[PDB]
Amino acid sequence: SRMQLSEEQAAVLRAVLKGQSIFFTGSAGTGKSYLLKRILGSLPPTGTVATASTGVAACHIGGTTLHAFAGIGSGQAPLAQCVALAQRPGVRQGWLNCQRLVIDEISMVEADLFDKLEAVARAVRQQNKPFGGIQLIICGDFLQLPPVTKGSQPPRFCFQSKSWKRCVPVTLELTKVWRQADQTFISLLQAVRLGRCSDEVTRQLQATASHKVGRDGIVATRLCTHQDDVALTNERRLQELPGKVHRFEAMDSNPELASTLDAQCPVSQLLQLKLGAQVMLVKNLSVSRGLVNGARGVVVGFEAEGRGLPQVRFLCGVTEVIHADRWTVQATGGQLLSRQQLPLQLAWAMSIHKSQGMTLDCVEISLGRVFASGQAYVALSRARSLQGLRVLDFDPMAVRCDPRVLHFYATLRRGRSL
Ligand SMILES: Nc1ncnc2c1ncn2[C@@H]1O[C@H](COP(=O)(O)OP(=O)(O)NP(=O)(O)O)[C@@H](O)[C@H]1O
Ligand SMILES: CC(=O)Nc1ccc(-c2csc(N)n2)cc1
Ligand SMILES: [Mg+2]
Ligand code: NA
């Protein structure tokens, strides 16, 4: 059986099944992505397209990227050239057959791109209504990760698009945090999300610097702003371990398209492991045994037989041999690509962008620098519990909310009861 939707969650589902285009929003861990899964399960699969702004986020809901669905290249070309690309075989059919378009993590989509997609929808489907008449089902949190751009200009938030409100006329909120169980931590995260670091908030985050978050042989994943820093840390730490290297080579359906696969898949072509390697499980294997996406462990052995698969001891307690898994990604024009590989990544470090949408339970972050709006909040709001979090050098300068977003939220709630 499945969990009981809150009243707020049920209201969103009601709107969607009435055919209403909607944006629904809420703090980290309010069940937005979970509700998207329930929505997709309640709709006919024909005519329903599941996307997210990013590859990492698309994985959480079993969807494709909005880039891959649109098939307009980067979206930087002139509109007429974007339309021509959208008319290509397979791409075109995707636009024509789409009756309902789901988009998670809307906060990373910039307004100029939204405008472009809206216009492409109209041109390709030859329907002179907002977004070509597609029912839009959009969610995310504009106080989380900010918009990116394939161009060179400062991006606008998606809600700045002159078509935003016309395309998503209804807005609902999820207000009950589920990810964290502890009210103290929930209240602390809410203050951070709104950029309200009181002396008490700042004191509580600084106190985490003393947290021992690692257990026997497992150490915290450091969350970093940039993948360069992640790659160098994981490689240096692996190198310093004394054991022999064990290698696991992925099998791809189209090796020549590996880079397309890489954008939408959490595992690498070449996985290298040693005794003592710090690893993250990047696929749900068994919710019951705590073997879920984000679970942290350490390699404690390799099997003597066959491929010599790794034995991994996880923080929760279970020790388990990790077998091959498989990811099938939906690329442009409905093309499918697959990768077979062990569902493990090295995890002495991880980028904040790769943690988007995830729950983690053994994390360290240094928060003494200016960050992107919403980025400090995303990093802190991944942790299930205050005790799996160690913040170093915390300073409220790290915590920034874009004034455009505070103004958006205030306008949104203007007529509401609370
Ligand atoms: N009705 C519910 N009752 C209990 N737990 C729930 C409910 N809805 C969602 N959850 C749990 O809440 C946790 C967070 O859900 P998730 O869908 O990741 O939230 P989110 O709002 O998408 N998070 P984020 O992407 O970080 O903003 C998951 O462990 C869900 O199982
Ligand atoms: C689509 C995609 O690229 N996903 C993804 C998710 C998580 C990670 C990860 C976990 S620990 C680490 N160093 N990296 C890598 C990749
Ligand atoms: Mg989510
Ligand atoms: Na990847």
Curated annotation (Swiss-Prot):
**Per the UniProt record, which EC number(s) apply here?**
5.6.2.3
Its Gene Ontology cellular component terms are: chromosome, telomeric region; mitochondrial nucleoid; mitochondrion; nucleoplasm; nucleus
Principal place where this protein is found?
nucleus
Question: Looking at the record, which segments are called Hydrolyzes ATP in the presence of both magnesium and single-stranded DNA?
Answer: 4-418
Compartment(s): Nucleus
Gene Ontology annotations of biological process type: DNA recombination; DNA repair; mitochondrial genome maintenance; negative regulation of telomere maintenance via telomerase; protein-DNA-RNA complex disassembly; telomere maintenance via telomerase
Q: What reactions does this protein catalyze? A: Couples ATP hydrolysis with the unwinding of duplex DNA at the replication fork by translocating in the 5'-3' direction. This creates two antiparallel DNA single strands (ssDNA). The leading ssDNA polymer is the template for DNA polymerase III holoenzyme which synthesizes a continuous strand; ATP + H2O = ADP + phosphate + H(+)
Binding sites annotated in the UniProt record for ATP? G26, S27, A28, G29, T30, G31, K32, S33
- Tell me yes or no: is Ubl conjugation among this UniProt entry's keywords: no
What is the induction comment? Tightly cell cycle regulated and expressed in late S/G2 phase.
Q: Which cofactors does it use?
A: Mg(2+)
Q: In which tissues is it expressed?
A: Weak ubiquitous expression.
| UniProt keyword terms in alphabetical order | ATP-binding, DNA damage, DNA recombination, DNA repair, DNA-binding, Helicase, Hydrolase, Isomerase, Mitochondrion, Nucleotide-binding, Nucleus, Phosphoprotein
Residue range(s) of DNA binding per entry: 375-394
All disulfide bonds of the chain are none
Task: Identify a single GO molecular function assigned to this protein.
Answer: G-quadruplex DNA binding
Q: What does the protein in this record do?
A: DNA-dependent ATPase and 5'-3' DNA helicase required for the maintenance of both mitochondrial and nuclear genome stability. Efficiently unwinds G-quadruplex (G4) DNA structures and forked RNA-DNA hybrids. Resolves G4 structures, preventing replication pausing and double-strand breaks (DSBs) at G4 motifs. Involved in the maintenance of telomeric DNA. Inhibits telomere elongation, de novo telomere formation and telomere addition to DSBs via catalytic inhibition of telomerase. Reduces the processivity of telomerase by displacing active telomerase from DNA ends.
Give the family from UniProt.
Belongs to the helicase family. PIF1 subfamily.
Quaternary structure, per UniProt, is: Monomer. Interacts with telomerase.
What does UniProt say about this protein's domains? The PIF1 N-terminal (PINT) domain enhances the interaction with ssDNA through intrinsic binding activity, it also harbors DNA strand-annealing activity.
Please report the name of this protein according to its UniProt entry. ATP-dependent DNA helicase PIF1
Q: Which organism is it from?
A: Homo sapiens (Human)
- The protein's gene is named PIF1
Summarize which stretch of the complete protein this chain spans. Answer: 206 to 620 of 641
